[PDB]
Symmetry: C5
Subunit: 204 residues, 5 copies
């Protein structure tokens, strides 16, 4: 468990191999969540930002960037997509929440809410996941795809087991995130596989 | 009747069934009206914003968004269209008024007056309407069309039986609208059908 | 004659019929003139803004908008065209002057001088005109063309029998035009024909 | 000689005929020069701004505008071209210097230096020129080309027999140029031929 | 040899011959380095900014501009590319660092950090280089290519044998660079070959 404050994971190249495994202490199925992180990439093609798979379930929870200005959330294989005006290339802060009771998914880009969408109302995302950054999973922990690899820098990743109110989203965006009980950048259990470098964050 | 202050209807998905029925004691034929509301959608295709049909009368009163930067009003099946510069996607405040005696239709977009157009001078829009959000009607209450469905968020919807002067339009835009006697967001009678979720308004 | 201060003509629809006739007490041939007015239209196709014909003479004096960013003046069937950066759609203030002795035509868009052009040096534009707003004449008083009709709003129309200096152009733009002897918005002699509505000017 | 302070040459129409001859008593071949002037044109096609020909020598010194954002200097039939971001149409202040010893040509657009280019190092531009505004010469004083004619307004033209330092360039742009010894707007010997009109400068 | 403060190399024309050799007594293979310089060119095609070759080694260290908004670093024949929003044409300040131990390459454009990339981790860039400005080498000191030549102005060139922290990059951008131990603009050992002119820096 490492304090990565002020630091990013650099995925310096395209590969089918470089990734970071994220280990969460959570062992119960997810009804509600919020996921925030910072990314800086100049890929124009599609890539996975956050890949969460469970046994026999691809795309159980997936944050996927299809193209510039477009963000997709997959819950249990089902997908929503929301659009935003953004410059390319540019650093970005991304928060996404999802609520089982309503099905509502909320993207926040640089503290700006995108249009709400809804999917998988009543569903629970399964526990005991494999979580990977830098690659998209098609199996429980593997079956990566070069054309979906993340190339660039990721920092300030937090994941909470609740839907964060606007004020806590903005706080995360501004660099004072509330401590997070699923994944916390300041106490992160992770394994680097292949070519991933930890560097100071210089682009905020 | 519900006070919806600070809240929105979220139509979280494309469908042919998700809609809200708006209930009003409108018994007298309309010679004059103003309709104001806020909307936030990232659809690029055409969609109905506000659909009002009467017995044997399609498109009796319809606010229809043909494409980005173009707003159409239908009165008694007749149509006018006006253009504006806008960003996409972006939250928008829309006011539209119409006046029988001159036939003049006025769109106001984020407090900004569009070019006046005119239609159905001397006409009275029929009473006893079925008013629906989220779908466009082709019958008296039904005959919805998936390709015309509204996906996104609608809030702050008011409707008056008179033509609002510019200062009152601006008041609505700024969030202090005058009391409204046809539809009022702070005392709204409505029916949710299918997948519509009420959420706080976070994008104003 | 009417004081049209704070008011516009609204030509609410495309037609081959709707127009306003303007009556001048001029009688003398024009060697010098300035014409100023405001217009708000979201037409993209070409249209006539100000059509002045005499017996047996088409396009004796015509202000014609070919396309966005381009303004044409016709004097005695001859034309010049000048370009400008403008937003679309957008309210605009237009002044045009012409001086026989030099032939110089000056367009002023929102108090901004366009490139000077020149035509019909030594020519006298004929008196006893039919002057129309909303349609382009191909005869003396008629032969209108739907594809040249003006749809939108026109206000603050003044015409002088002299070439206004930049100061006077700016004054008119900023809302205090010098007293005008050919045509005067504050004492206008006009005939409405077909669908033209007088409304308060709300876009300035 | 005429003091043209506050005045421009207006070339109000395209032609193969309209031009201004500029007269200088220069008998000594040019080793160094700076040329500054103001131009306002809405031509999109190529045009000559300043044409300097000597006997049996085309394009001895030529300032030619190929298209928007690109300025060309010809010295002794050789060419350099430099690019700039500019709006269109827009008034522009242009300075260009050339230095034989280095061959360096410097364009300055609205007081902004363009990328330096180099041509004809060691060369002397020939004396006893015919200098024309409004047309491009292909002979000694004539052989004009309609498609190269300048339509628009030129003012504040000065030419020095030395390379001006940046400070004197900014001075020219700001409207306080140093006295010039080849050509001087405030003591200009010229011949108008065809349709060219002197008018006040209104666009600065 | 030679304080070039306040001065630039001007490469005034396209050629296969015009270049500047930069001489340094570097005998130790580089593990870490930072290179900073100022460039101003209106070339649209690809060109080499900084060409560093060793005996039998092409593209040992090379800064290459593929197209507008795209910067490439070659280390030992391998390359990375990073993208940026930039105006064209425009003066630019470029810093690039590379670090053997991590393989990380950092581009800084006008003091703005680009997305980090990585190449040749564990590699040492060879010493005893031929370093040239204005041309790209394919041999040890020669084999130039006209389609790769730099046309324009270069100044403020510094090279350090370490990775400069962001603060030091900004200092170089602001015009107060730290003394550099490989290449220093204020004490530069150079050889001008062909048409290269030293001029004052006027675009900073
Ligand atoms: C004939 C038919 C069909 O059965 O209808 O199958 C082939 C084809 O349909 C597909 O190929 N469907 C799957 C498309 N793949 C896709 O959308 O992948 C997305 C979601 O999954 C990820 C994120 C992934 O897990 O790698 O990649 C991007 C056309 O329709
Ligand atoms: C041959 C002919 C003709 O008879 O002239 O008929 C077929 C075709 O004409 C039409 O299809 N006309 C109706 C077009 N439909 C239309 O404009 O729908 C609009 C208005 O109504 C709504 C808003 C609607 O109520 O769904 O949808 C978009 C071409 O012309
Ligand atoms: C063969 C020939 C010729 O004789 O050269 O005649 C037919 C054709 O030339 C024309 O048709 N010329 C007249 C074009 N009409 C035109 O420019 O109308 C303009 C000006 O007048 C207005 C403003 C109008 O008054 O309606 O409409 C646009 C090609 O050349
Ligand atoms: C066969 C050959 C050749 O002999 O190499 O000559 C004909 C052709 O090359 C040219 O025609 N070159 C001259 C083209 N004209 C040109 O560049 O005009 C420029 C420069 O001169 C001015 C400024 C002018 O003086 O009119 O107009 C624009 C192809 O190459
Ligand atoms: C057949 C094959 C192959 O063997 O794979 O070689 C020929 C072709 O591949 C190339 O030609 N590759 C090299 C192309 N040149 C290139 O990428 O130049 C870059 C890098 O080198 C510089 C900087 C240079 O040193 O000139 O120019 C730009 C297709 O693939
Ligand atoms: Ca997958
Ligand atoms: Ca995959
Ligand atoms: Ca309908
Ligand atoms: Ca329908
Ligand atoms: Ca006509
Ligand atoms: Ca006509
Ligand atoms: Ca010539
Ligand atoms: Ca020529
Ligand atoms: Ca090479
Ligand atoms: Ca090469």
């Amino acid at each position: 468990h490492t304090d990565l404050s002020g630091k990013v994971f650099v995925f310096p190249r395209e590969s089918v191999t470089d990734h970071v495994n994220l280990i969460t202490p959570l062992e119960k199925p997810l009804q509600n969540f919020t996921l925030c992180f910072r990314a800086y990439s100049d890929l124009s093609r599609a890539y996975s930002l956050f890949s969460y798979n469970t046994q026999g379930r691809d795309n159980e929870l997936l944050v996927y960037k299809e193209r510039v200005g477009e963000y997709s959330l997959y819950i249990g294989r089902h997908k929503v997509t929301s659009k935003v005006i953004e410059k390319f290339p540019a650093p970005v802060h991304i928060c996404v929440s999802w609520e089982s009771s309503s099905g509502i998914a909320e993207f926040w880009i640089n503290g700006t809410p995108l249009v709400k969408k809804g999917l998988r109302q009543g569903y629970f995302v399964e526990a005991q996941p494999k979580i990977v950054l830098g690659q998209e999973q098609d199996s429980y922990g593997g079956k990566f795809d070069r054309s979906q690899s993340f190339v660039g820098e990721i920092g300030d990743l937090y994941m909470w087991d609740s839907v964060l109110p606007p004020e806590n989203i903005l706080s995360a965006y501004q660099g004072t995130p509330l401590p997070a009980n699923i994944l916390d950048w300041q106490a992160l259990n992770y394994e680097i596989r292949g070519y991933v470098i930890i560097k100071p964050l210089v682009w905020v």
